[PDB]
Amino acid sequence: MKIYRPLWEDGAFLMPQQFQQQAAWDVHLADSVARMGLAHPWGVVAAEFDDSLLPLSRLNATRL
Amino acid sequence: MKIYRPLWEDGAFLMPQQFQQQAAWDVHLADSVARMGLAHPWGVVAAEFDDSLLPLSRLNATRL
Amino acid sequence: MKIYRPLWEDGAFLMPQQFQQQAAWDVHLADSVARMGLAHPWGVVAAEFDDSLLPLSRLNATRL
Amino acid sequence: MKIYRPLWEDGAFLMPQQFQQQAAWDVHLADSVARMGLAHPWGVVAAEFDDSLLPLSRLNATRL
Amino acid sequence: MKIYRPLWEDGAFLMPQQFQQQAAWDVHLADSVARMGLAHPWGVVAAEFDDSLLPLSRLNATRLIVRFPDGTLIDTERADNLPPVCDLSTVSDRSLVDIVLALPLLNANGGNLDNGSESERPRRWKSERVNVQELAGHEQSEVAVLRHNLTLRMAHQENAAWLTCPVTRLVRDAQGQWCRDPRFIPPLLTLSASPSLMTELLELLHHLQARRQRLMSMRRENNARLADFAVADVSLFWLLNALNSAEPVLKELLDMPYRHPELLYRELARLAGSLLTFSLEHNVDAVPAYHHETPENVFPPLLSLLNRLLE
Amino acid sequence: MKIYRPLWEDGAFLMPQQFQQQAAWDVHLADSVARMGLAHPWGVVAAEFDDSLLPLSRLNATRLIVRFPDGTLIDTERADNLPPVCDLSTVSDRSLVDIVLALPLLNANGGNLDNGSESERPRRWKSE
Amino acid sequence: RVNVQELAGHEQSEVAVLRHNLTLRMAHQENAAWLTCPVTRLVRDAQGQWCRDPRFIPPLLTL
Amino acid sequence: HDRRRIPLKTPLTMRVHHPVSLKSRPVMGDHATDVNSLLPDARLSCRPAAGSPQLGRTAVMR
């Protein structure tokens, strides 16, 4: 998606894309530091549901 | 506890509560990466003292 | 070359060596995340080259 | 407990007990408003503690 | 009137007229809070008298807490002094005196009552000098506490440029002596300023529980009767519905001190309007309407209606 | 918006914070007593108008008793003057109009409307 | 001693505000002179840790 | 030198601008800086104040 990286010098000035790409870059490093969490893909650590809403044929989440 | 990642768009004032929360979220990501493998309350890395002053009962730390 | 955590006040002067010494701390954090199970100076993923100019004395990298 | 609300007309030297007994009397009037319909004393609105500090035993509070 | 908020600007000097305008605003906030649960203006928390000095005919108070309809609270235990003794000798040969408590009105031109020297206008806020200081370590110097100006007015109390709230009612006994009558009580912010009510309503509730116990003894003993189609058994089923639905609310409310009586009225009206349609031939107009501004000829005929239906 | 509250002893310089914070705390107490079995996105007690100017393009209000959901009381018989005349010169379709009684939002560094200075945000103000 | 801002546009200054002397005690001690309200309950768990019961309820002004 | 405070600048300008923006020196928050007794009490109309302070009235000790 062409994740750019901004340049801050004495004449550089403020934009929203200054901060959005720098936000995305350290998200992208979190996959590059996984050499087993890339072996198996991304996972699920907690998922808990409610059963009392089922006789009404509804469904609602609690923790995800 | 709660962690509030800011929205970035062309309206917002440059308020200091954005940067502290955005920097706080990256520690949580970098720790959820480290809990993919090990399981630990963290430990020391280096701890070296100076045995010169010790006849005068004063202890100092050169590197921690 | 030390790294300084910048302090986000309010009602002060902004300088780009707050942004730079902010940005250079997260990479140093991800380094010490990575160096907890693995123990080497890391290397290459997926180098690819061009071969057409090779009758002459010329090279051309394509993806690194 | 001998709550003395004072008066101010003229020439009265300022003195802290006027302010203190005024502030107490406002609390007492606002208490007697609430004690008309409900016949309940006060209680707890919110009490949230910290759970990540429990197995290393301490106890820190957040909202009381 | 015209109540004004002050502005605490820097460089605005000081005036005594500021603090009065501030302190006559939070009282108005208290009414604006409290009038989300009130029909009609207020009454008595508690009132206790000393009838021992009656053969030397007089009357004096002991403990008296009454709220007034402008938001003024009276406390003899913490804030105010007791009203002076009443002299009944000019009404020595009549039968009934209805005694109200009085504070004068407030107009927007005067203020306190300066030593009674100009006493054609009855005015409140009598001052006093008590020295109490000790919330940091010393007691010495002397402040001007404010006290109100309370009297008692009994027989031509209807000539009032005053605010009235009735407290007690005297009758001639057969030995010519006045005594306090155990009768109807001018209005209540509690159920504690009327021991006659706390004697009657406990009898009401203890009378209610026994009839329900009698009804349960009729039907639980026979297992066919729990779902029978007898024309009295359907009425008895619906009657246990009407009693079991309305017991624990009243049992909660009557194991309790002070609580405003409109809430109790809304729970007795449901029981009366339920049981009214069960064994009668009389009009729905037997239900009394609620008059709080009166001294309550509502609350005894209601209970006289309910004590007839349960037998 | 924190709400501080002071101590008095043995001679302290009277500062306007020591009165403002005390007024704010007694507003907050009355609202916390007012929650206690209610809802509080609260509303309007009484609103009365003046309706003669409708053959012209104007509108005027005569009585407003409004309680805002933060718990601030506005009582136009007592310590608040009626807002100025509404304006109807810029209305195209005649079912559009829905009128809201505005009131400027307070911030933790501002203050009053000193006239002779301009701003893109107003405040409550010293009048009289 | 903090610096509360005037709410009329000027600078702030240093006043003395009050702060309550609250504390956290345990029920099995002596608690005569204080004025208490219970807030939570701790139990012991299988590995020898402390954890919170989800079963206690305090006295509540709110649900 | 005196540690002055406010003058409130009339646009806030720290909207993070997309179409046109500038940095070099002027950056801030919302309030700048600019480096460059024996007295009586609450009586009537006009002489309460010692200007801004009010003391000299409750030293009853020492």
Side-chain angles (χ1 to χ4, degrees), chain B:
Chain B
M1 296 183 288
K2 299 289 184 180
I3 293 172
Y4 293 149
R5 294 179 288 179
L7 184 66
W8 293 101
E9 60 94 19
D10 195 7
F13 293 162
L14 206 283
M15 294 182 288
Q17 295 87 16
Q18 295 168 353
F19 291 162
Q20 297 176 357
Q21 291 287 320
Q22 178 61 43
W25 177 254
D26 293 333
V27 181
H28 182 70
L29 278 177
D31 192 78
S32 68
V33 170
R35 292 191 186 276
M36 297 296 288
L38 271 303
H40 66 103
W42 297 87
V44 306
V45 171
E48 293 174 352
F49 294 145
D50 195 358
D51 293 335
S52 67
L53 291 172
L54 281 176
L56 294 173
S57 293
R58 186 177 293 172
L59 183 62
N60 196 358
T62 57
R63 183 177 67 183
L64 298 171

Side-chain angles (χ1 to χ4, degrees), chain E residues 122-157:
Chain E
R123 291 296 176 269
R124 60 184 182 180
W125 301 354
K126 289 180 179 178
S127 69
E128 196 186 0
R129 296 179 66 89
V130 182
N131 49 356
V132 164
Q133 283 183 338
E134 60 273 16
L135 285 176
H138 68 282
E139 298 177 354
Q140 287 91 23
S141 178
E142 180 172 357
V143 301
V145 188
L146 180 139
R147 305 290 181 181
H148 287 86
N149 192 0
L150 294 168
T151 65
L152 292 174
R153 293 171 73 94
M154 58 180 177
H156 292 285
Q157 79 278 29

Side-chain angles (χ1 to χ4, degrees), chain E residues 42-119:
Chain E
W42 279 326
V44 178
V45 174
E48 297 182 358
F49 278 153
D50 192 359
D51 54 352
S52 63
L53 296 175
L54 261 54
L56 305 176
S57 177
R58 295 293 182 269
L59 187 57
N60 194 358
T62 61
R63 178 178 182 270
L64 184 64
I65 296 170
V66 169
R67 191 178 176 95
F68 279 158
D70 61 349
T72 305
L73 187 64
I74 303 300
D75 193 354
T76 58
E77 294 184 355
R78 292 179 177 89
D80 296 330
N81 291 317
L82 293 169
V85 63
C86 183
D87 194 1
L88 286 82
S89 65
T90 66
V91 194
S92 66
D93 196 358
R94 278 178 63 188
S95 64
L96 293 172
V97 290
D98 294 331
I99 296 171
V100 304
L101 176 62
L103 277 183
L105 295 173
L106 177 62
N107 55 0
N109 289 315
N112 60 358
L113 191 58
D114 194 1
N115 294 317
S117 64
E118 297 175 352
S119 63

Side-chain angles (χ1 to χ4, degrees), chain E residues 191 197 200-201 261 264 268 288 296-304:
Chain E
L191 296 175
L197 269 69
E200 183 175 0
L201 291 174
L264 177 61
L268 288 172
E296 297 179 353
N297 52 7
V298 173
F299 197 87
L302 181 67
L303 297 176
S304 177

Side-chain angles (χ1 to χ4, degrees), chain F residues 20-84:
Chain F
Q20 288 168 352
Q21 301 293 320
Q22 188 64 46
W25 183 254
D26 294 332
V27 173
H28 175 71
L29 282 171
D31 285 327
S32 173
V33 172
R35 287 185 176 93
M36 282 283 172
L38 291 174
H40 72 279
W42 277 335
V44 172
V45 172
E48 300 177 358
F49 275 161
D50 194 359
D51 299 329
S52 67
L53 295 171
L54 289 176
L56 295 180
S57 298
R58 294 293 189 266
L59 184 65
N60 201 359
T62 61
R63 189 176 177 182
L64 292 177
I65 316 297
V66 178
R67 185 184 181 91
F68 283 149
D70 57 350
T72 302
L73 183 60
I74 299 300
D75 193 358
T76 54
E77 296 180 354
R78 282 166 286 181
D80 40 356
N81 196 0
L82 293 172

Side-chain angles (χ1 to χ4, degrees), chain E residues 265-266 268-269 272-273 276 283-291 296-306:
Chain E
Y265 180 74
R266 282 203 294 261
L268 288 172
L276 184 145
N283 195 0
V284 183
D285 291 332
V287 175
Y290 182 73
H291 292 286
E296 297 179 353
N297 52 7
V298 173
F299 197 87
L302 181 67
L303 297 176
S304 177
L305 173 60
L306 288 174

Side-chain angles (χ1 to χ4, degrees), chain A residues 8-10 14 19 26 33 35, chain C residues 16 19-20 23 26 30 38 42:
Chain A
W8 287 285
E9 67 175 1
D10 299 331
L14 309 177
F19 294 98
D26 290 332
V33 295
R35 282 82 184 267
Chain C
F19 289 158
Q20 295 181 358
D26 295 333
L38 306 172
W42 297 274

